[PDB]
Design an enzyme around this catalytic site. Structure first.
Site, PDB file in Angstrom:
ATOM      1  N   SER A  10     -37.588 -13.214 -31.199  1.00 25.41           N
ATOM      2  CA  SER A  10     -37.278 -12.248 -32.245  1.00 25.41           C
ATOM      3  C   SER A  10     -36.124 -11.398 -31.738  1.00 25.41           C
ATOM      4  O   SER A  10     -36.293 -10.639 -30.781  1.00 25.41           O
ATOM      5  CB  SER A  10     -38.485 -11.389 -32.581  1.00 25.41           C
ATOM      6  N   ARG A  11     -34.955 -11.522 -32.369  1.00 25.98           N
ATOM      7  CA  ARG A  11     -33.785 -10.810 -31.871  1.00 25.98           C
ATOM      8  C   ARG A  11     -33.999  -9.305 -31.890  1.00 25.98           C
ATOM      9  O   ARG A  11     -33.573  -8.601 -30.968  1.00 25.98           O
ATOM     10  CB  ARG A  11     -32.546 -11.170 -32.683  1.00 25.98           C
ATOM     11  N   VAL A  12     -34.643  -8.783 -32.934  1.00 25.02           N
ATOM     12  CA  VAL A  12     -34.831  -7.337 -33.016  1.00 25.02           C
ATOM     13  C   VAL A  12     -35.649  -6.851 -31.825  1.00 25.02           C
ATOM     14  O   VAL A  12     -35.296  -5.863 -31.170  1.00 25.02           O
ATOM     15  CB  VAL A  12     -35.480  -6.945 -34.355  1.00 25.02           C
TER      16      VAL A  12
END
Lengths: 128, 47, 55
Positions: free
Chosen positions: A117-119
């Protein structure tokens, strides 16, 4: 509509691997030349233009948001296939479910090793 | 079709994970021993 | 599986076979040496046990 009117929405396409098949059937019956695995050339576009509408408007544009959770279906875990790779390179995160984990008792089978998950840090409560 | 070095861990089958663990356990043990020795040297060299 | 899966698996098994052949050769050499050293130790140990089975 919701994200443009200051509200929050969540959309779940289920699956996108079947929208790809329907698009391929359409394109082949319009006589447009096929591509790789018979999918039209515009099969990445098909999805990229669709998943790029899941934005997070700033407070000047209402502040609304639209989350998206596309669902893809791989064949025997071959994540390396065509549509899976397209959508993986389109989306932000991923949640890999594996049958070897499903039968080993781990349910949901989420493969925490590969799931991303990039966030990450952001979009998580302080306690969590 | 040939074979190349470092292929057992490229496949990632059972032997790949088995080898990775056989390496990690051993080097965790040696790291623990070396950290103990480092602490001992730290204490013995204060004066 | 796909072609790359099969290729990687085949390469891994080939490496494993090479390693096991080498280890068989090493073990055979060490075995020959061990038998050579076992004969005299066989007589020595049997002698050392002689007493208890005789008395």
């Amino acid at each position: 509509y919701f994200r443009d009117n200051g509200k929050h929405a969540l959309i779940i396409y289920d699956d996108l691997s079947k929208q790809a098949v329907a698009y391929r059937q359409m394109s082949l019956l319009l006589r447009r030349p096929p591509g790789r695995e018979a999918y039209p050339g515009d099969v990445f576009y098909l999805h990229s233009r669709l998943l790029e509408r899941a934005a997070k408007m700033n407070d000047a544009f209402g502040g609304g948001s639209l989350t998206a959770l596309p669902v893809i279906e791989t064949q025997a875990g071959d994540v390396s296939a065509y549509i899976p790779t397209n959508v993986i390179s389109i989306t932000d995160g991923q949640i890999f479910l594996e049958t070897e984990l499903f039968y080993k008792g781990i349910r949901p089978a989420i493969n925490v090793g590969l799931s991303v998950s990039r966030v990450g840090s952001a979009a998580q409560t302080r306690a969590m | 079709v040939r074979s190349s070095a470092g292929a057992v861990r490229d496949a990632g089958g059972a032997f790949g994970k088995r080898e990775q663990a056989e390496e990690e356990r051993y080097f965790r043990a040696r790291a623990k021993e070396q950290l103990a020795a480092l602490k001992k040297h730290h204490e013995n060299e204060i004066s | 599986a796909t072609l790359k899966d099969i290729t990687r698996r085949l390469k891994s098994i080939k490496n494993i076979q090479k390693i096991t052949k080498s280890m068989k050769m090493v073990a055979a050499a060490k075995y020959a040496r061990a038998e050579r050293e076992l004969k005299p130790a066989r007589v020595y140990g049997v002698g050392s046990l002689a007493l208890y089975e005789k008395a």
